Amino acid sequence: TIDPKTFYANPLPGKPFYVRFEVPSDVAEKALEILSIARQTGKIKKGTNETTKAVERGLAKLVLIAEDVDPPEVVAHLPLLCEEKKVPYVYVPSKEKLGKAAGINVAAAAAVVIEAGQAAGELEALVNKINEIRAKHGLNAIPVR
Amino acid sequence: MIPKPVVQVPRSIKSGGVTKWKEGRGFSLGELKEVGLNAEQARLLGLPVDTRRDSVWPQNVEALRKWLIEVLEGKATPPEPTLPKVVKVKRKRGRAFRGLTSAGRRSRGLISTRFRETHNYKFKKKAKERRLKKRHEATKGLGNVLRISRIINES
Amino acid sequence: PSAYQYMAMWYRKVGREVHERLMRSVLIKWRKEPAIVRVERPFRLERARKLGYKPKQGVVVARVRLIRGPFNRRRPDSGRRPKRMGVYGITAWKSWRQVAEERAARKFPGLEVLNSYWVADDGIYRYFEVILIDCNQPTIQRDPLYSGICGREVPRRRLARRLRERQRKLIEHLKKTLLPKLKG
RNA sequence: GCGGGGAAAGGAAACAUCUUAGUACCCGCAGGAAGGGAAGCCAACAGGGACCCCCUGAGUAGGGGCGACCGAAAGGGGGAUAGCCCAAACCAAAUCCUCGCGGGACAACCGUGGGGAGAUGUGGGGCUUGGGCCCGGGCAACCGCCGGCGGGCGGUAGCCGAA
RNA sequence: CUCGGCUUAGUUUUGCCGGGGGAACGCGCCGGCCACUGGCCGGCAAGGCUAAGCACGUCCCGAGUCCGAUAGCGCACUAGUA
RNA sequence: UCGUUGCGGGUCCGCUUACCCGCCGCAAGGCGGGGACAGCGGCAGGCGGGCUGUUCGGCUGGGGCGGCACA
RNA sequence: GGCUGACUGGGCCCUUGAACGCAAGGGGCCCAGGCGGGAAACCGGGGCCUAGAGAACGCUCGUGCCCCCACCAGUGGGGGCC
Ligand SMILES: [Mg+2]
Ligand SMILES: [Mg+2]
Ligand SMILES: [Mg+2]
Ligand SMILES: [Mg+2]
Ligand SMILES: [Mg+2]
Ligand SMILES: [Mg+2]
Ligand SMILES: [Mg+2]
Ligand SMILES: [Mg+2]
Ligand SMILES: [Mg+2]
Ligand SMILES: [Mg+2]
Ligand SMILES: [Mg+2]
Ligand SMILES: [Mg+2]
Ligand SMILES: [Mg+2]
Ligand SMILES: [Mg+2]
Ligand SMILES: [Mg+2]
Ligand SMILES: [Mg+2]
Ligand SMILES: [Mg+2]
Ligand SMILES: [Mg+2]
Ligand SMILES: [Mg+2]
Ligand SMILES: [Mg+2]
Ligand SMILES: [Mg+2]
Ligand SMILES: [Mg+2]
Structure with a gap:
């Protein structure tokens, strides 16, 4: 519904x-560390198809998007x-x-x-x-979920 | 004797209501369900199965029931199953050069029309007819010769 | 809806203008590179996956640039009747997609062309992506889709024995489960 | 055999549209055959049921300085018979290749370790009798990999064969 | 869809190539000899494979109301040779 | 004329990254000038023996000119 | 003086075209419809007679409660016979 142009x-x-x-780099590193604590304690998904499915289904709390995707249309x-869907998202420099x-x-x-197990406050x-x-x-604010 | 399915020849408007019967491609799924088999079981038994057909013919059903009764009572040996027994796939060399990719198929017209109606098919067919001097190509101008002769002899 | 469905929107009406803005900058660098270039990933991932692309060893994606317009029809320099002396508007029965496939096949000798797809146009050039497979790679030979290009054989003893065993067991089961219903 | 480029002479009692002819010829690309092949089909309210090739439909419809001349298809009868997969839905690395060692018909494969591919998706699943998804019941489950062991037959030299 | 062209029996209606424009989504889309509307009927394009049954003759085998050294393949022979 | 053809400001002015032209550079890229013009592809009109294919009838005190005694 | 027969739909015959095949064109004799002139008879299908004359394809017009266009009906359009 949001017009891309x-x-x-x-x-x-x-x-x-x-x-x-x-x-900024400190925020990107912070979001990477929250993804790490979510993987070790709560629940995450990795990959574009799985992330899109999560965002459509409404189970997403935070999304991380790489800035070094060679075809950007991926x-x-x-x-x-x-x-x-009103889900917060942040950019990270390296897909690696x-x-x-x-x-x-x-x-x-x-x-x-x-689900962020031990990283809810962070x-x-x-x-x-x-x-x-x-x-x-x-851009408008996107409140936490 | 393995029965052969009997189907109706399609009644065209040209025919005017004269109908006849012919050997069908295979038994219908409704006819097979009437006797208690699916397509896989029938093909394992060796029957010809036509999953496309919608008709159900009682003569086909009776023949199926009779032959299946002989088969189950052991008085008849079913043929080998009607499924692929060989898998021979050749390595493809120069598909793009011989026009076998999707673009080549589209340019040859196989996406839109039938193979028999494509232009290369017409070229090859007429070339073979002219080489062999087949049915109509044994004489050039056959239609015009017939037309003039009919005019002269029916005046 | 998969991610590929959203990826397709950039070649639809909703995402065309932004994609065209991107292409106006990408085509500048594409216009300077060689005519045929192997690329790490396809530009249209969903289209490539539909046409049979997978990121396996021995699968090559090649971007091909060529000149659009009708083919270079030649004016005859010898005698012809007037129907056979035209130049403008006469084209070839081949398309530029098949031309690009053949050119990529020439560049990668021994590989086989699987498919190709249009990517973009400018005033002079058209760009295609051609998928090619190495049929000598073990990673390609056993693929169920790529076996249709690289060849595949099954010994007839295997299929005949399995079908015969299945038929025997089916008759044995039907003797119990179908004969009374048939006869009654 | 497949894809592409592609004439004129002659005929039309001249000749240009046309035909000759998508031929001659040229460029490229395969196999022991190739190409085609599994309904966004044909029909007409009755029904056929992938494909190719043969006989016919038929020189019929139709195309055409409606001239020369060109020219189907459906349908019917036969040869033969065969049906499947990729992508996606859903799961998310459960995957594949290579190599070393041990086992394993010299194989597949199994255990183990290193490397390569792989979240831009390996693999599972799915293919009109649409599928995914949820629930219940049952095996005659289904689907693949290797071609070891034994046997038979035939071919690639020959032997016997009446008076 | 439109313009140009080659082709086709395809004709206001065949297929394709090039230039320009350019969808929808199964509550959808496609076809039923000009176009549209309604009904009815038939299907699911724009991805890949597939044995058998069919072409050919360097070659191997067989046959012949075929020719019989100016014939028959140009060559019955130290012929594609001098 | 359609497309290439984009970005601003009020049919017009400006800009550069497109594109084009030259210089340096192996290349990467840099310099300068032009600039959404030009060039290029499609379509359309004009000039067009530069090139291709053809036609230039008949009767006839021989053919030609003449005439039509060609309806 | 009065009119439009230089008429509508058809047929047969003569000549072009001798006896003897063969276009178009032209003329004659009529039947039906409906007319004009005339008391009526009778005449009128151009000019007193013998010259002024044109196939196929295509287009256009006139005509018919006309026929057809691809599963059925309708609308626009196309074709057909004279
Ligand atoms: Mg013919
Ligand atoms: Mg000629
Ligand atoms: Mg000749
Ligand atoms: Mg001639
Ligand atoms: Mg001549
Ligand atoms: Mg074959
Ligand atoms: Mg094949
Ligand atoms: Mg022809
Ligand atoms: Mg996968
Ligand atoms: Mg002996
Ligand atoms: Mg002698
Ligand atoms: Mg001799
Ligand atoms: Mg310009
Ligand atoms: Mg121009
Ligand atoms: Mg000249
Ligand atoms: Mg002349
Ligand atoms: Mg003369
Ligand atoms: Mg003269
Ligand atoms: Mg005459
Ligand atoms: Mg005479
Ligand atoms: Mg006259
Ligand atoms: Mg029909």
């Missing part, structure tokens, strides 16, 4: 077109879906590091946290920080 109307310099806001739909935090031997373009703080960054970038 208006959502991606202002691409940021030096980034793929699907990246809406700049995520993951370009995920931010639009996250905005339509995203896959390592997800626990697989290969890179992952996207990942999602279904996830809330991260969501608030991404919400403030979206506020600076002009």
Whole structure:
């Protein structure tokens, strides 16, 4: 429902077109660590198809999207879906590091946290920080789930 | 003797209501359900099975019941099953060059029309007819010769 | 709905304008690279997966750039009747997709073309992606789809024995479970 | 045999549309055959039921300076008979390749360890008698891999054969 | 869908190539000899494979109202040779 | 004329990244100029013996000119 | 002086075309419909007679409560006979 031509109307310099806001390195590393605690204690999914299925089904709490997907159209739909479903999402620089935090031997373009076992408070703080960054970038806030 | 399915020849408007019977491709799923088998069981028994057909003919049902009774009572030996007994797949060399990919098939017209109606088929068919001097190609201008002769002899 | 269904939207009306904005920048660098280039991943993943792409060893995706328009029809330099002297508008019965498939097959000798798909156009060039398979790779030989290209044999003794055993067991079962119902 | 490029002479009692002819010829690509093949079919309210090839439909419909001339298909009779898979839905690395060692008809495969592919999805599942999904019951389960052991037959030299 | 072209029996109706425009989604889409509307009927394109039954003759075997050294293959022979 | 053809500002002005032109550079890329014009593909009109195919009838005090005694 | 027969639908015959095949065109004799002139008879299907004349395909017009267009009906359109 969210129109892509208006959502991606202002691409940021030096980034793929699907990246809406700049995520600092400390926030990206923080989100990677929350994905790590979710994998060891709660529940996560890794891979674009599984993450899209989670976001559609409504079981997603936080989505992580890589900024180094070579064909960007592989993951370009995920931010639009996250905005339509009101799920917070954050960008991470390396799909290789995203896959390592997800626990697989290969890179992952996207990942999602279904349940954050020992990382609920950290996830809330991260969501608030991404919400403030979206506020600076002009997009509306996406409340935690 | 393994029975052969009997089906109705399609009654065309040209025929005017004259109907006849012919040997069908296989027994229908309704006819097989009438005797208690599916397509897999029938093909294992060696019957010809036509899962596409919708008709159910009582003569087919009676023949199936009789032959299956002989088979189950051991007075008849069923043939080998009507399933593929060999799998021979050849390595394909130069499919793109011989036009066997999807683009080649589309350009040859097999996506839209039948193989018999494609233009290359027409070319090969007429070439073979002219080479062998077959049915109509044994004489050139046969239709015009017939037309003029009919005019002269029926005036 | 899978992720590939959403991936397809960039080649639909809803995502066309943003995809066209992306292509206006990607095509600048594509116009400078060689005519045929092996790529790590297909540009249209869902289309490639439909056409039979998998990320296995021995599967090659090649981007091919060629010039559009009708083929280079030649004006005859010898005597012809007037119907046979035309140039403009006469085209070949081959398409540029098949031309791109043949060119990629020439570049990768011994590999077999599986399929190909259009990717983009500019004023002069058309871009295709051709999927090719190495039939000598063990990872390709046993694939159920790629075996149709690379060959496959089954000894007739295996199929005949299994079918005969199945038929024997089926008659034995039907003797119990169907004969009284048939006869009654 | 398959894909592509592709004439003219002659005929039309001249000749250009046309035909010759998608031929001659050229370029490229396979197999012992190739191509085709499993209904977004044909029919007409009655029904056929993948495909190829043969006989016919038929020089009929139709195309055409409606001239020369060109020219089906459905249907019927035969040869033969065979049906399946990839992707997706759903699960999410349960997967595949290679190599070392031990076992295992010299095989498949099994255990183990290293490497490679693989979340941009390996694998499972699915193929019109649509499927996925949920529930219940039953094996005649189903589907694949190897071609070891034994036997028979035939071929690639020959032997016997009446008066 | 539209324009140009080659082809086709395909004719306001065959297939395809090129230029330009360009869908929907199973409550959908496609076909039923001009187009549209309604009914009825038949199906599910734009992915891959598939034995048998059919072409051919370097070659092997058999036959012949075939020719019989100017005939018959150009060559019955140190013939595709001089 | 359709497309390539994009970005601003009020049919017009501007811009550069498209595209084109030249220089340096192995390449990577850099410099300068032009610039959504040009060039290029499709379609359409004009000029077009540059090139291709053809036709240039008959009667006839021989053919030709003439005439039509060609209806 | 009065009119439009330079008429509608058809047939047969003569000539072009000798005896002896063979277009178009032209003329004659009529039947039916409905007319004009005339008291009536009778005449009128152009010009007192013998010259002024054109196939196929295509297009156009006139005509019919007309026929057909692909499973059925309708609408627009197309074709058909004279
Ligand atoms: Mg003929
Ligand atoms: Mg000629
Ligand atoms: Mg000749
Ligand atoms: Mg001639
Ligand atoms: Mg001549
Ligand atoms: Mg074959
Ligand atoms: Mg084959
Ligand atoms: Mg022909
Ligand atoms: Mg898979
Ligand atoms: Mg002896
Ligand atoms: Mg002699
Ligand atoms: Mg001799
Ligand atoms: Mg311009
Ligand atoms: Mg131009
Ligand atoms: Mg000249
Ligand atoms: Mg002349
Ligand atoms: Mg003369
Ligand atoms: Mg003269
Ligand atoms: Mg005359
Ligand atoms: Mg005469
Ligand atoms: Mg006259
Ligand atoms: Mg019909």
